[PDB]
Each structure stands twice: as structure tokens, then as C-alpha cells.
A paper describes a structure:
Here, we report crystallographic and biochemical results on the structure and substrate selectivity of AspH. The results reveal a key role for the TPR domain of AspH in substrate binding and, unexpectedly, that the preferred EGFD-substrates of AspH have a non-canonical (Cys3–4) disulfide pattern. Whilst the oxygenase domain fold of AspH is typical for the 2OG oxygenase superfamily, details of its active site and the role of the TPR domain in EGFD-substrate binding are remarkable. Whatever the precise extent of conformational changes during catalysis, the results reveal a central role for the TPR domain in enabling AspH catalysis—without it, 2OG turnover occurs, but EGFDs are not hydroxylated.
Next, we assayed AspH for its ability to hydroxylate truncated 26mer hFX EGF1 substrates (aa 86–111) lacking the Cys5–6 disulfide-forming residues, synthesized using orthogonal cysteine protection to yield selectively both the pure canonical (C26mer) or non-canonical (NC26mer) disulfide isomers. Only the NC26mer peptide was hydroxylated under normal assay conditions, whereas both 26mer peptides were hydroxylated using redox buffer conditions. A structure of AspH in complex with NC26mer was obtained (AspH-TPR-Ox:NC26mer). Comparison of AspH-TPR-Ox:NC26mer and AspH-TPR-Ox:hFX structures reveals little overall difference (Cα RMSD 0.13 Å). The presence of a Cys3–4 disulfide bond indicates that the additional residues present in the longer 39mer substrate, which were not observed in electron density maps of AspH-TPR-Ox:NC26mer due to disorder, are likely not essential for substrate recognition.
Residue numbers in the entry:
A (entry chain B): 99 to 111
B (entry chain A): 330 to 758
């Protein structure tokens, strides 16, 4: 999953 | 404290000490050959093997090579294959393997290592926790939840396990359930609980349940250096960038891009409407749990600076228009997308992941009333053919209470004060 609009993922990178 | 020498290694402690000393002196060049010599002489010595692995590690730092580090990763496992390996040394060698495997992005491989560590040390809670992280880094929230559940059954007070359990719960939209775990977990003060992520999500979960203590945690999170400010709570940041909720075109320097969007806004609209009519499947619902209610879908042309070829076949002129502007098409921490929101929609207050982008909104179809967007302490409305610019790393909130749909065009640009080099190197989001 990707963080597009928010910060939902444990890591975005 | 940690005993690393087995029966045999104790009989060669001198040579082993001799070699290690060279490594500590920074002379990582001849320390390798030294441990390589001991490995050749004592091919079953764990400490000699671990020595070799550690020097290879440092050499990977000096040289900045992935192959030599990849080599060290194997040497670290080699240690575990040898006989009569002391527990402390066994744990150390495999932990560092995982660490570096995660550094290289071998998350799948780092998992098997962590599973092995938990199998070898079934009583070590901290390893179960690290295993949990292993699952989280591959997006396996289901298995991560099991792990932290397994941990809390035995250790209800482990704060690390609590924040992470709370994090998983909130990501599952178990908002109320998540709060005590996130809160108690941070308050525990255990190592690894002072993370911006848990501050960020505790406060958001609090906001959603109408708990006015939310900004008390945003404030604390800011005081501990996680948030640039209480309003701006992005976590992937380049410190120093001009921070303000609302920007004017002139302020961004991207005046040509704005002109182009506003001059050609009708073809942008029409191609979006055409997709709505004849290809509504290209519009995907927002899938980040940012909605309290309503319908919100997005049709994406660019993400992570990569063009979606099939999508652009639905908006060919629009994509052709934007190819002229690398400040947006090359923004690897932003998107270009149509965004449609229907009446009865409310988007929770939220923040984007990075301060490295500014967000442009071109009004395409804006009902006369009902649609508004708050960024920080100021609310604004869209106009058809007009560009709004805001920094979505600041808290912002959206409403749609019109009597028909609202369509906009979203264009992300690199933060203007980012140097060309920064724009080249920053990992994508
Ligand atoms: O697209 C919309 O209607 C709302 N957009 C946002 O909240 C955003 O761009 O970050
Ligand atoms: Mn947003």
C-alpha cells in the first residue's frame, strides 16, 4: 500500500 | 556482559582479541585478512566467523557496496550454521543480519530470519516484537496483529507491543479500541514507543471520536521533535522548508504551470467528464480511511513521478499538456489526478505524509454552494477554472453538501525550495 493522501501505512517509503 | 566464546574459542582468545583490536582501530582492511586467517585456521570458530562478518559490515560502510554487505549478510548466517555457538553470539549475529537485510530491502528475507530468531529463542519478547515489525514492513498486518496479541497475552505491560497493536487497530478502523493501546504504549516510555507515527495516529483517532485531548498529544509530539508544528504533522520531511497552509502562484514560482492549467481548464474538465461518462471505472474510491461518510473517488494520471499509460489514454490532451511541466510530472512524492466528491461527504481532518510537496487544485465542476476545504485555521472554496494551492502536510478537512457532484484536478509539485539534487535523491512516496 502507498501513502498518497495520508499516513496510514507503517512505512510509506 | 555478553558471553560470546564457546569452549574452543576460549583457547584462542588471544588471536581473536588480536584481530578484533585491529577492527576497533578502524584498520578494517587488515582486520578482515586477520579474521579470514582465523577462519581458515579454525573453520568451526563462531567468534572468528562473527569477526569476519563484522569487518565485512564495516567494509560495506567504507566502500558503500551492497555486494560486500550482501556477503556480510551470508557470513552472519554462516555463524549460525557452525556448531556450539553461544546464545548471546547466536542472537547478535542473526539480529544484525535482519537489520541489514531490512537496510537492503530484503524484507521477505529479513522475515525468515526473524521467524528463525523467535524459533531459536521462544522466550525472548523483544524478538517477537521485531518479528511483528517484520510483518508490518511487508504490509502483512494480519500476521503482525497475531504476533503482538501473542506477546500481550504473556506480557500485557510491554509498551512496544501496545503502540504497535494500537497502530494495527487504527489502521483497521478500530478507532475507539486503538486509543488505549496507543496512549498507554507511548506513556509506557519503553524503547521504540516515542515514535511520531503513534503520536500522529493517537491524535487522529482522538479527533474522530470527539476527544478534545487530541491536540494535547499533537503538542507533545511536537515538543519531542516529531512534528514540525502542531498543525503540520507530516513525518517524511526536509527540515527548513517554508511552511505555510496556503500559497499563491507567485509564491511558488510555478506561475507558468498555473497559467497553463487556468487557460486550458475546460479541456481538462471535458476529458474528466468524458471518463466519468464512458469509463467511470478509472475512478477509484479513496482507500485510506479518510472519510467519515460519502462518496469520494480519484482518477490518477501520475503517481510517484510515473505516468500511468492506460489512464492517460482517457485524458490524452491533459497528459500531453502536463508533459511540459517536470515540476509536477517529476514529483515522485506527489500525484496528478482528477478528484470527484459527491454530496453527503465529510473527510476527516488529516495530513499528508511529506512536506516536500505543494498541492494544486483546479476547479472543474464546482456547485454554487456546499463545497469547502479547511487547511489549518482557514477555510476556502473552489472556483471553476481557478487554482488553489495549499501545503497538505498541514491538517486539512473537506466537506461536500451540495446538490450535485464536485470535480477538481489535483496537481502536486515539488516544494519550490527543494534543490534539484534533493528532487533527484529523495525516495518516492
Ligand atoms: O480531492 C478532494 O476533494 C479533497 N482533497 C484533499 O484533501 C487533498 O488534496 O489532500
Ligand atoms: Mn488530503
Amino acid at each position: 500500500g502507498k501513502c498518497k493522501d495520508g499516513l496510514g501505512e507503517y512505512t510509506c517509503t | 556482559k555478553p558471553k560470546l566464546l564457546n569452549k574452543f574459542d576460549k583457547t584462542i582468545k588471544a588471536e581473536l582479541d588480536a584481530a578484533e583490536k585491529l577492527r576497533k582501530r578502524g584498520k578494517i582492511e587488515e582486520a578482515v585478512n586477520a579474521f579470514k586467517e582465523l577462519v581458515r585456521k579454525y573453520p568451526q570458530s563462531p567468534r572468528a566467523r562473527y569477526g569476519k562478518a563484522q569487518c565485512e559490515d564495516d567494509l560495506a560502510e567504507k566502500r558503500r557496496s551492497n555486494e560486500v554487505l550482501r556477503g556480510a549478510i551470508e557470513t552472519y548466517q554462516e555463524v549460525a550454521s557452525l556448531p556450539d555457538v553461544p546464545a548471546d553470539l547466536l542472537k547478535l549475529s542473526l539480529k544484525r543480519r535482519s537489520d541489514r537485510q531490512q537496510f537492503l530491502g530484503h524484507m521477505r528475507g529479513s522475515l525468515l530470519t526473524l521467524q528463525r530468531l523467535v524459533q531459536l529463542f521462544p522466550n525472548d519478547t523483544s524478538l517477537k516484537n521485531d518479528l511483528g515489525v517484520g510483518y508490518l514492513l511487508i504490509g502483512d498486518n494480519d500476521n503482525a496483529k497475531k504476533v503482538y496479541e501473542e506477546v500481550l497475552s504473556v506480557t500485557p505491560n510491554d509498551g512496544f507491543a501496545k503502540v504497535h497493536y494500537g497502530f494495527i487497530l487504527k489502521a483497521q478502523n478500530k478507532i475507539a479500541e486503538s486509543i488505549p493501546y496507543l496512549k498507554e504504549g507511548i506513556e509506557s516510555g519503553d524503547p521504540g514507543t516515542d515514535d511520531g507515527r503513534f503520536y500522529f495516529h493517537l491524535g487522529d483517532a482522538m479527533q474522530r471520536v470527539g476527544n478534545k485531548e487530541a491536540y494535547k498529544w499533537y503538542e507533545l509530539g511536537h515538543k519531542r521533535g516529531h512534528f514540525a508544528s502542531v498543525w503540520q504533522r507530516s513525518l517524511y520531511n526536509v527540515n527548513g522548508l517554508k511552511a505555510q497552509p496556503w500559497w499563491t502562484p507567485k509564491e511558488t514560482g510555478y506561475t507558468e504551470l498555473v497559467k497553463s492549467l487556468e487557460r486550458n481548464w475546460k479541456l481538462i474538465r471535458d476529458e474528466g467528464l468524458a471518463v466519468m461518462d464512458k469509463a467511470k471505472g478509472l475512478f477509484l474510491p479513496e482507500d485510506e480511511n479518510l472519510r467519515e461518510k460519502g462518496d469520494w473517488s480519484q482518477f490518477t494520471l501520475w503517481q510517484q513521478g510515473r505516468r500511468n499509460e492506460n489512464a492517460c489514454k482517457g485524458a490524452p490532451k491533459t497528459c500531453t499538456l502536463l508533459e511540459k511541466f517536470p515540476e509536477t510530472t517529476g514529483c515522485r512524492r506527489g500525484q496528478i489526478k482528477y478528484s470527484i466528491m459527491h454530496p453527503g461527504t465529510h473527510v476527516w481532518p488529516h495530513t499528508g505524509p511529506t512536506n516536500c510537496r505543494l498541492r494544486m487544485h483546479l476547479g472543474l465542476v464546482i456547485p454554487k454552494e456546499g463545497c469547502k476545504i479547511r487547511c489549518a485555521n482557514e477555510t476556502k472554496t473552489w472556483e471553476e477554472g481557478k487554482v488553489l494551492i495549499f501545503d497538505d502536510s498541514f491538517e486539512h478537512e473537506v466537506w461536500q453538501d451540495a446538490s450535485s457532484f464536485r470535480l477538481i484536478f489535483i496537481v502536486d509539485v515539488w516544494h519550490p525550495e527543494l534543490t534539484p539534487q534533493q528532487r533527484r535523491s529523495l525516495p518516492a512516496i
